[PDB]
Design a protein around this motif. Sequence first.
Motif: not given
Lengths: 120, 453, 37, 49, 24
Positions: C2, C4-6, C10
Motif C-alpha cells: 500500500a 500507491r495511496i501516497l 502528478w
Amino acid sequence: QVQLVESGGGLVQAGGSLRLSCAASGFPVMNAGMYWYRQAPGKEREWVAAIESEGTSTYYADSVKGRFTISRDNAKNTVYLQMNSLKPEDTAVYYCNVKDVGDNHFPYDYWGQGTQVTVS
Amino acid sequence: IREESSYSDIPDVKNDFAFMLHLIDQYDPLYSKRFAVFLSEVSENKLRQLNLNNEWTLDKLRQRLTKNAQDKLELHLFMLSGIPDTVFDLVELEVLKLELIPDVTIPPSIAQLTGLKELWLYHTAAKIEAPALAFLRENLRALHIKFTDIKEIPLWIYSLKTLEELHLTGNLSAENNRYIVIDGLRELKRLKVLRLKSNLSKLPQVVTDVGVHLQKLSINNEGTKLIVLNSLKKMVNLTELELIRCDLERIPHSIFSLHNLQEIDLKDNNLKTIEEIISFQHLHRLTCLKLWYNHIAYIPIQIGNLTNLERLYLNRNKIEKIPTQLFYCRKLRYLDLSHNNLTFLPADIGLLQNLQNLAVTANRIEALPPELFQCRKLRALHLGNNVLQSLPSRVGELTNLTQIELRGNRLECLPVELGECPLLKRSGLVVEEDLFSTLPPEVKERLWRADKE
Amino acid sequence: PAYRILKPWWDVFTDYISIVMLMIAVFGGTLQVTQDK
Amino acid sequence: LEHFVSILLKCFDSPWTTRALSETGVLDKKEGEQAKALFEKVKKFRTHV
Amino acid sequence: LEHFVSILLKCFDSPWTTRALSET
C-alpha cells in the motif's frame, strides 16, 4: 417559547408609589412559582418576593417585610408587584424568575430582561 | 465532515500530519473521511459508552445489587465513566447511587425502571432530558447529593414535585446572599425530610418557611456557629430536630414551641447547661431527647417532671451524679449514659421495669443495686471499662435479657446461675476468654450444641 | 503493498514520463554505441 | 510514511468506522476493545508525528 | 539480527504496548 418580560421602570423620588408587572409566555402562572429578585450595582442579587404555586401564598424577605404587595392575575397571565413608598436605599434592578414550569427542558429557570427603578 | 457528520469537535491537524492527509485526499477523500472519526472526542466518548455497556453486562450489575440500610435494592456506581444502558434494565432496582461519574446524562431509559425511589448524586452533575425528568418528577422519593460548588448541583432539583427526602452535603454559603441557590426550595410541597450540611451560619429563611410541613430536619455544620433567633416557631408539625455539630453552645429558646417534636438531637453543640427541661414540659410527646457528645456538668432535677421519656441520651458527657428524680420516668427503653464520670447508680433505677437497652460504658461503677436486676424486661446492657469486682448471682433470674457486655471490667468471678436463661448464645454473652472458663463446662457444651442455628 | 495511496496523479505522470525518457535514453545510447561513425 | 499508512489502513478497515458512518443491534466485546486500542494508537501516532 | 527484527516488530504493534503507553 418561554420568556419573561417586565415593565414599569422609571425614576421616582421618595414619596410616591410605583407599580411593577411582568409577562409570562408559554406557561400558565397559576401552576408555577414566581419569584422577584433585586440587583444593584456592585451587589449580588437578593430575593424580594415569592408567590407559591398551588395555593397562592406570598413570601417576603426579612428586608422587605410588610411593605410590598404581590398578586397573580391569570387574565393577563402576569404577576403584579406593588411597593409602598420605596426608600432611596431600595433603588435596584428588579429581576423576575420562575423555575421548573410544567414543561421540563434544559432551561429550568427563566429570568426577565430587568427594569431599573431609581429613588433619590 | 464537520458540516456533514454534525461532529464539529474535530480539531485542525498541525504540520507533518496535515500534509499526508492532503496527499491522501489527493488520492481520494474516502480514506480521510474514514480516518477523521478517530480525531473526534464525540466518537471517542461514544466508544467509551458502548464499551462500558458491553463490559458492564446486565448479569454483572444484577449480581452487584446490594441492600441499603433501609433494606431495599441499591446499586452503587463509583468513578465509572458513565451509566451503562444495562443498568436501566434492572426494574427491581430501588436506589441508584452515582459517585464521581463525569458528565453524566440521565437517559430517558430510566423510565424503564419502575421501583426506583432514591437517587444519589455524589459529586456528579447530571443533565436530564424531558421524558426522564417527567418520570423523576412523578416517581422519585429521595434525592441525596454531595457537592463542593453551588453551580455543580443539578438545576432540575426543584422540579421533583413528589420528592420526600432531600440531602444536601455541600457548601450552600454563596457570595453575600441569604442562600439564593436554594431559594426555590419552596416549590417542593411534598418534602418531609431535610438533611442540610453546609456549615450554616444563619438558618435560611426559605428553610424556616418550608419547615411548616417538615417531619425530620437534620443539620450538621461541623462545629460552625448557627443562630436560630425565633426561626422554628413557624413549624408546628416537626418531629425530628437533629442539630449535630451546629455550635449552638446552648439549647435554643425557640425549641420549646415545637410541641410535636419526638426526636431531638444536639450532638457536639458545646452545650453548657440543660436546665431548660422545665420549659421542655410543653412537649408532651417527646420521647427521644438526645444530647450526647456534649459537656453538661450535672443532670437537672426537672427530668423527673417529664414522664414520657423513652430514649434518653447523655453519652460522652461529664456528669458526676444522677439525681434520683430522673428515675421517675417509667417508660425508658433506650436509656444510655456512657463515657461519663459516674460513681454509682441509685436504687431507684429498679423501679424502671420498662428498660430495654442500657449503656454504662467508661463509668467508675463499683457495683449495681439488686433492685436494678429485679426488672424482667431488659434486653441489652453494655458495660465497658467499669471497675466491677463481682457480679451478683441474681442476674440469672433475667430471662428476657438478650445480650450483655463485660469487656474491660476487672472481673474474676461469673455466677453459675448466669447460664440458666431461655435465650442465651455466644453472640449475646461475650466476655474475656479466661473469665469464660470460670463456669462449668457441661452448660458450655450444651450452649455450643445449640449455637449452630 | 500500500504505497500507491501516497502517490498523487502528478507523481504517477512524472514516473511515466521518467520511464519514457529512460526508454529514449536507452535507444539513443544503443544507437550511439553501435553506430556512431 | 509507513506508520501513517498502517494507521490509515487500520482506521479504514475498522468496523467501528462503518458503524459510525451508518449512525446517521449488539457489538462484540473484542471489537470494542480493538476500537479503543485503535483510538489510543491514533492518539499516540498524532502526538508523535 | 533477524531475531531482533522479529522481536522489535512484535513489540511495536503489540496490543499491550498501546495500553502500557497510555498508562504512562
